[PDB]
Design a protein around this ligand. Structure first.
Ligand SMILES: *[C@@H]1O[C@H](CO)[C@@H](O[C@@H]2O[C@H](CO)[C@@H](O[C@@H]3O[C@H](CO)[C@@H](O)[C@H](O)[C@@H]3O)[C@H](O)[C@H]2NC(C)=O)[C@H](O)[C@H]1NC(C)=O
Ligand SMILES: *[C@@H]1O[C@H](CO)[C@@H](O[C@@H]2O[C@H](CO)[C@@H](O[C@@H]3O[C@H](CO)[C@@H](O)[C@H](O)[C@@H]3O)[C@H](O)[C@H]2NC(C)=O)[C@H](O)[C@H]1NC(C)=O
Ligand code: NAG
Length: 592
């Protein structure tokens, strides 16, 4: 028996026991995440810990099989993924050290309460009190205090922690065949085999950077517009040819300029399409929302939800009978038990959200044919990108009129279109540079290119040169503002949002081009395009069996990211911004 045949037997065993154990874990997690109950909490911990142990032991055993001697790229990929043990190689001592550091950083983050000068008790935790301030306040001093306090009482505390976390994680990375924790994270995009469908980890840097080059002009003009309107709101502090203060971006970090819409609304009279009132009138219940979503997916040719979906999902808050976590989640428990958890209300947002989450469900149903280790999206962004393209189609007033939530005679005034596209811009085009800069700083820091003495300095240097944002109060290396973000303090990648964003518009433009739609890409409802849903399935079923490049080619027609779809989607807004910015400054001073 060739070592590969023995390998097949190994994996065929792994997936057979794993599929099961993961289903047991997932059912326990449905129990806890729904029927919050200490008992159920304890059972969740038990089952998840058994999953952890199984994966770890099977990973060691997989290492005892040599990847270099595996033929079928499919088998090789499953093995490779299972062979990536990670924390195992480090001594159990060092393991507990890093576990304690991650736990302590997350506990500092969660236990984050800053107090207000003049108030010895206005001290409030982050999620309850601080954010509203950073999103619905027009007081420079209040927002300033919040921003400074977090990056002061929390970032400083995390500073030594993250300092040692970098060294430990780097040792873990190089413990595996890796140059830095950066290369380890970049490997999630690394795939090999097939014809030229291979993507080396270091190519990710090249591609992210060139895509950001093409997106830079749009971000520049968006910067101008937001800057000028904010100037009129905060005149004493904003400079016309300068970067923007961080505390005025709409959230503690300024990851999404969405909350700046009231202060930066194009026009401002033409109301915003809110079918919410219409839903409230047609008595649309949560089930009706999800049923219309089902009808959409059937229209493009995709299947409809299992009986199990309608019978086992929690589509509504559990009245008052139980206590639940509301954050919307899509669930593939394994073994065909697909579900969705949401505290669905009667709101356009929850409607579009149901379409997104059900798109996740459809992806899950489409790759059930694949084995366990290949039952996932091709990269880390395929999934949420599919989800988002659903909401894009379900937001076009065309589809809103079809479902009967907007009168037929209703017409789109160019003004309302610009308003909508600008809101999309802040939330999308705003996080794009923020994301690039965050992950670049982390990548270089893990690569060591940024020494600790110039750790924070570079950070704000980039925040200005890239993001176009400036520090309100100068911060020394005593601070650690990067750790101030949950995705950074809790050891999570961040480039996923950038990649997802670039992907979703590529997908939407390809599929729309299939539906033979003509006109702006912000007006596309792939509804009834059997061919569109067919291409989508022809990718979705592939899972991660085939290279992510292959999935892309099967859908969009290219093997690598392309920003041209994103630009085409926002091009109207781009031109309007250019004209609105002619007699003003488009750019920002680096040192300011
Ligand atoms: C989903 O869309 C299909 C498209 O034809 C609708 O046709 C239904 O197809 C199903 C499956 O082939 C047929 O079997 C049914 O399955 C459900 C799910 O377990 C079960 O509850 C039914 O008693 C039946 O066994 C079904 O006869 C057929 N119905 C038609 C043609 O009216 C289907 O209606 C959609 N899904 C569901 C659950 O109805
Ligand atoms: C995508 O395709 C669907 C078809 O499933 C389109 O919805 C359909 O729209 C037509 C025209 O309004 C509806 O016609 C209706 O026929 C019934 C037959 O009894 C009649 O009583 C009504 O007065 C009306 O004329 C049709 O029922 C409806 N399909 C449904 C409700 O399942 C939809 O407009 C298409 N969307 C896009 C973006 O192309
Ligand atoms: C919720 O948990 C409690 C405590 O473990 C248990 O007695 C009860 O049967 C559970 N109910 C549901 C609906 O999960």
């Amino acid at each position: 028996p060739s070592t590969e045949d023995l390998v097949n037997t190994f994996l065929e065993k792994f997936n057979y026991e794993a599929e099961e154990l993961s289903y047991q874990s997932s059912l326990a997690s449905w129990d806890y995440n729904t029927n919050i109950s200490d008992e159920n909490v304890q059972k969740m911990n038990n089952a998840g810990a058994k999953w952890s142990a199984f994966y770890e032991e099977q990973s060691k055993l997989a290492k005892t099989y040599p990847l270099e001697e595996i033929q079928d790229s499919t088998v090789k990929r499953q093995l490779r993924a299972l062979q990536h043990s990670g924390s195992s190689v480090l001594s159990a001592d060092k393991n507990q050290r890093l576990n304690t550091i991650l736990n302590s950083m997350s506990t500092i983050y969660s236990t984050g309460k800053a107090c207000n000068p003049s108030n010895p008790q206005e001290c409030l935790l982050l999620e309850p009190g601080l954010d509203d301030i950073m999103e619905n306040s027009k007081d420079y001093n209040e927002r300033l205090w919040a921003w400074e306090g977090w990056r002061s009482e929390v970032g400083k505390q995390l500073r030594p922690l993250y300092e040692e976390y970098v060294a430990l994680k780097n040792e873990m990375a190089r413990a595996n065949n890796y140059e830095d924790y950066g290369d380890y994270w970049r490997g999630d995009y690394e795939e090999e085999w097939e014809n030229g469908y291979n993507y080396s980890r270091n190519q990710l840097i090249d591609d992210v950077e060139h895509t950001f080059t093409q997106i830079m002009p749009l971000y520049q003009h968006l910067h101008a517009y937001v800057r000028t309107k904010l100037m009129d709101t905060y005149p004493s502090y904003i400079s016309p040819t300068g970067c923007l203060p961080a505390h005025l971006l709409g959230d503690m970090w300024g990851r999404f300029w969405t909350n700046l819409y009231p202060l930066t609304v194009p026009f401002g009279q033409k109301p915003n399409i809110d079918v919410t009132n219409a839903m409230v009138n047609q008595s649309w219940d949560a089930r009706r929302i999800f049923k219309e979503a089902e009808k959409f997916f059937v229209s493009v040719g995709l299947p409809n939800m299992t009986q199990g979906f309608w019978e086992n999902s929690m589509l509504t808050e559990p009245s008052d009978s139980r206590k639940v976590v509301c954050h919307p989640t899509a669930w593939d428990l394994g073994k065909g038990d697909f579900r969705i958890k949401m505290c669905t209300k009667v709101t356009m947002d929850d409607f579009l959200t149901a379409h997104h989450e059900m798109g996740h469900i459809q992806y899950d149903m489409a790759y059930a044919a694949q084995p366990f280790l290949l039952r996932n999206g091709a990269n880390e962004g395929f999934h949420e990108a599919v989800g988002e393209i659903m909401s894009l189609s379900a937001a076009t007033p065309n589809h809103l009129k079809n479902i009967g939530l907007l009168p037929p005679s209703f017409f789109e005034d160019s003004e309302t279109e610009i308003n909508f596209l600008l809101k999309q811009a802040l939330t999308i085009v705003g996080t794009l540079p923020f994301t690039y800069m965050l992950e670049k700083w982390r990548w270089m820091v893990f690569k060591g290119e940024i020494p600790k003495d110039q750790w924070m300095k570079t950070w704000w240097e980039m925040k200005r040169n890239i993001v176009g944002v400036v520090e309100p109060v100068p911060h020394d290396e005593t601070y650690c503002d990067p750790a101030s973000l949950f995705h950074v303090a809790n050891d999570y990648s961040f480039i996923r949002y950038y990649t997802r964003t670039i992907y979703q518009f590529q997908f939407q433009e390809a599929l729309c081009q299939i539906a033979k739609h003509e006109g702006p890409l912000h007006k596309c409802d792939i509804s009834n395009s059997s061919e569109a849903g067919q291409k989508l399935l022809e990718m979705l079923k592939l899972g991660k069996s085939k290279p992510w490049t292959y999935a892309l080619e099967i859908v969009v027609g290219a093997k690598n990211m392309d920003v041209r779809p994103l630009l085409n989607y926002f091009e109207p807004l781009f031109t309007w911004l250019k004209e609105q910015n002619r007699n003003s400054f488009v750019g920002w001073n680096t040192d300011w």
